[PDB]
Design a protein around this nucleic acid. Structure first.
Ligand SMILES: [Mg+2]
Ligand SMILES: [Mg+2]
Ligand SMILES: [Mg+2]
Ligand SMILES: [Mg+2]
Ligand SMILES: [Mg+2]
Ligand SMILES: [Mg+2]
Ligand SMILES: [Mg+2]
Ligand SMILES: [Mg+2]
Ligand SMILES: [Mg+2]
Ligand SMILES: [Mg+2]
Ligand SMILES: [Mg+2]
Ligand SMILES: [Mg+2]
Ligand SMILES: [Mg+2]
Ligand SMILES: [Mg+2]
Ligand SMILES: [Mg+2]
Ligand SMILES: [Mg+2]
Ligand SMILES: [Mg+2]
Ligand SMILES: [Mg+2]
Ligand SMILES: [Mg+2]
Ligand SMILES: [Mg+2]
Ligand SMILES: [Mg+2]
Ligand SMILES: [Mg+2]
Ligand SMILES: [Mg+2]
Ligand SMILES: [Mg+2]
Ligand SMILES: [Mg+2]
Ligand SMILES: [Mg+2]
Ligand SMILES: [Mg+2]
Ligand SMILES: [Mg+2]
Ligand SMILES: [Mg+2]
Ligand SMILES: [Mg+2]
Ligand SMILES: [Mg+2]
Ligand SMILES: [Zn+2]
Lengths: 175, 209, 142, 38
RNA sequence: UGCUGAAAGCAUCUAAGCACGAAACUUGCCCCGAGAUGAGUUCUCCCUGACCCUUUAAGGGUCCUGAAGGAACGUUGAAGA
RNA sequence: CGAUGUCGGCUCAUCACAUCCUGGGGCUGAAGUAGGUCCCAAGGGUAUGGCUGUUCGCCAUUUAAAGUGGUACGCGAGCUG
RNA sequence: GUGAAGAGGGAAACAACCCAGACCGCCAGCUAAGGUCCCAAAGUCAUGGUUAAGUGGGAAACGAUGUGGGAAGGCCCAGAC
């Protein structure tokens, strides 16, 4: 609807291949491919992609607006990339990087190693900080949720893996 | 991995240096000789068919002796068949010795148990006897009740009753192999395997590790 | 005169190949049970099998509407007292996909020795191929 | 998770959402407010 | 429990799409199991004679032949009413 | 009512889930340990004795737990009386 | 009013419900209730809508931005939400 009516302008250095409902968007950070819903009509007006409800479908503007915000994020992913920051709160909590295997040390009796996916590159500036970059927004958010899932932050001291931007609402242990 | 066909020789004990007596079951394993290699193109699965022992020439039948004669191997007392894993193959007239188990540590031994005959539910299903006194009329080892009243006019399937006990295929798992004596064709496993003395055994490497 | 009846010796039967890709299960199956029964023939006789042999292929690509792919349940009972079993549509498709067509047609056929003889003519295949080229089967579009 | 037949907004931060055929109350402020109609 | 994400310019685990998730479920382990009449598969072995018939057909009969194998009998069994 | 043997115990059980244990979670007036509460879950498991005809109950000592019910208040052509 | 003392068809089966009152025979026709994808006779009829719950094909107080239709209202290109 109001999101779908606003067309998405493709910049320079962003290659667009239309194939039915499948759209491949290349760029200087990688290529991304997504098959759209059949209810969505997509067309490239030489500087913008437009997104309209294909007729005979109920969620017309809903699927068009989802395909809009998706290809907007695919464009920004292939020309800038996304960067999700995580921080570690707690004594003895740390992280180390071996290529694409983050070696977490989260106060367990066993080492935590997490294999990174394909288009995701990580880096620890500090032991208590993880900065991960990549193209796909769903993937960087999934990997950050998975790394948070090892030590979801305790509400009594904020201890555990948190997002670098989220707020952690604490709680006092009364008696 | 494949197994080998042996025979239960009996039980004995291995005194260690440390003063431990290990109760072992001696399994002689003669040269298992292959008679047929089965594959996916003809048979739908990958396996070998082996034979062991000897047999009387007047008693081995012309179909069976032609089946051994095609492989070009001496007639044995039976034919068993072992499924093959991948990357594992054997030729037809190949002999397989007990050195196959030279570096295994646990085996599973499959045998035919002893025949207890027609057994009651006390022996077979470990039912409790009823009272031997206090009034019991002819009902000391009977199974008692077998159902319920009219709701399922019927006894359920698999109700534990008397019948044939034993004389059937059982497999004991994770037996520690003690000694592999290739020179006199033996295999000493810890503990008691099924079967009577002199019966055929199937020793396979342990799948549960 | 007397009303004509078909005779099992003089009756002729034909062979048909049906592709089951994308077709609705029950709307396919009632036409299969119609042509196995023989209700498309003027020589129909209730007590005589006058239907045609039907080969159904691509049985794993049959379609159902709604959420029935994850919500249609095939119960059965093993005879033993706890022995109620249960499989969904997509589980039956993964395990043995021929049973879905077989069950729908067996439910749409008559019950008895003749209905079992009508079911013996249904020959389903998950794939797109069959060994019955020797019977020169014609195609049928349903 | 309170599980009730009657689910209601309890504060300004409650949001009624229907996830998979189930009416659910979620609250960003108070975790006590999260509800599930059953 | 989430990720991305609109419908509903925000928000939202869901509507499209994706991920995790229990002694339950299907497997994996053990046993029976092709009367699975939908009666399956593989391997091997055995038999390669003459003639009459009328109602001529998946027909009936004569003589010669008697295979592979089995069964029976006997000695029996840690198999067994 | 020209007969459907009616308590309790014993022996065999079997199903439900409104789950006692074990399993997975949410909230906590949840620091941890230990708990409270609700949701999912029926795979397996789920005391011995004293008294009493007892079921029950009380008591003693255990146990991960000593589940709640249906089954002609399961089961006398199975026993007891 | 029916059954009793009344058959037939339908309601899966179903004395008392719905249609309808069996003199006999017919390998004739029209209809009732109820029905017309297959079991199982007859529309996969036509036109226009609704539902996404297998609702249909079991149930309440109550709860909810499910969705369709209608009538009105108050903010608003002096710029609303
Ligand atoms: Mg014996
Ligand atoms: Mg006793
Ligand atoms: Mg007496
Ligand atoms: Mg006695
Ligand atoms: Mg009955
Ligand atoms: Mg009938
Ligand atoms: Mg989202
Ligand atoms: Mg959004
Ligand atoms: Mg998973
Ligand atoms: Mg366990
Ligand atoms: Mg009486
Ligand atoms: Mg009587
Ligand atoms: Mg809890
Ligand atoms: Mg429950
Ligand atoms: Mg239980
Ligand atoms: Mg299981
Ligand atoms: Mg007691
Ligand atoms: Mg005493
Ligand atoms: Mg019961
Ligand atoms: Mg009662
Ligand atoms: Mg009773
Ligand atoms: Mg009785
Ligand atoms: Mg009694
Ligand atoms: Mg009786
Ligand atoms: Mg009547
Ligand atoms: Mg009737
Ligand atoms: Mg009537
Ligand atoms: Mg009825
Ligand atoms: Mg008419
Ligand atoms: Mg009418
Ligand atoms: Mg019809
Ligand atoms: Zn709230």
């Amino acid at each position: 609807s109001r999101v779908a009516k606003a067309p998405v302008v493709v910049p320079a250095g962003v290659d667009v291949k239309i194939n039915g409902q499948v759209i491949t968007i290349k760029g200087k950070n990688g290529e991304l491919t997504r098959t759209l819903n059949d209810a969505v009509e997509v067309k490239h007006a030489d500087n913008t992609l437009t997104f309209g409800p294909r007729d005979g479908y109920a969620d017309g503007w809903a699927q068009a607006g989802t395909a809009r915000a998706l290809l907007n994020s695919m464009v920004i992913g292939v020309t800038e990339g996304f960067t999700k920051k995580l921080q570690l709160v707690g004594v003895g909590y740390r992280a180390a990087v071996k290529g694409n295997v983050i070696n977490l040390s989260l106060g367990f009796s066993h080492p935590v190693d997490h294999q990174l996916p394909a288009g995701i590159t990580a880096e620890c500036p500090t032991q208590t900080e993880i900065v991960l970059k990549g193209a796909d927004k769903q993937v960087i958010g999934q990997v950050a949720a998975d790394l948070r899932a090892y030590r979801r932050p305790e509400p009594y001291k904020g201890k555990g893996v948190r997002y670098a931007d989220e707020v952690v609402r604490t709680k006092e242990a009364k008696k | 991995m494949i197994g080998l066909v042996g025979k239960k020789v009996g039980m004995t004990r291995i005194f260690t240096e440390d003063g431990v007596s290990i109760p072992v079951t001696v399994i002689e394993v003669e040269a298992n000789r292959v008679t047929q290699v089965k594959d996916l193109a003809n048979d739908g699965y990958r396996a070998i068919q082996v034979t062991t022992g000897a047999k009387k020439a007047n008693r081995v039948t012309k179909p069976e002796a032609g089946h051994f004669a095609k492989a070009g191997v001496e007639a044995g007392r039976g034919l068993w068949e072992f499924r093959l894993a991948e990357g594992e193959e054997f030729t037809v007239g190949q002999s397989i010795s007990v050195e196959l188990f030279a570096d295994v540590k646990k085996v599973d031994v499959t045998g035919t148990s002893k025949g207890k005959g027609f057994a009651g539910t006390v022996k077979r299903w470990n039912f409790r006897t009823q009272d031997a006194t206090h009034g019991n009329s002819l009902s000391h080892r009977v199974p008692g009740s077998i159902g319920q009243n009219q709701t399922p006019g019927k006894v359920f399937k698999g109700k534990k009753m008397a019948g044939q006990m034993g004389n059937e295929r059982v497999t004991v798992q994770s037996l520690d192999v003690v000694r592999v004596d290739a020179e006199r064709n033996l295999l000493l496993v810890k503990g008691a395997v099924p079967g009577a003395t002199g019966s055929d055994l199937i020793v396979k490497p342990a799948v549960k590790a | 005169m007397k009303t004509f009846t078909a005779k099992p010796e003089t009756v002729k039967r034909d062979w048909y190949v049906v592709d089951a890709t994308g077709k609705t299960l029950g709307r396919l199956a009632t036409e299969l049970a119609r042509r196995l029964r023989g209700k498309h023939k003027a020589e129909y006789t209730p007590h005589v099998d006058t239907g045609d042999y039907i080969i159904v292929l691509n049985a794993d690509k049959v379609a159902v509407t709604g959420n029935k792919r994850t919500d249609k349940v095939y119960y059965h009972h093993t005879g033993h007292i706890g022995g109620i079993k249960q499989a969904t549509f997509e589980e039956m498709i993964a395990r043995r996909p021929e049973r879905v067509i077989e069950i729908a047609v067996k439910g749409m056929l008559p019950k008895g020795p003749l209905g079992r003889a009508m079911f013996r003519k249904l020959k389903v295949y998950a794939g797109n191929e069959h060994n019955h080229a020797a019977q020169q089967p014609q195609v049928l579009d349903i | 998770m309170k599980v009730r037949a009657s689910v209601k907004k309890l504060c300004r931060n409650c949001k009624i959402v229907k996830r998979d055929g189930v009416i659910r109350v979620i609250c960003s402020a108070e975790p006590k407010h999260k509800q599930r109609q059953g």
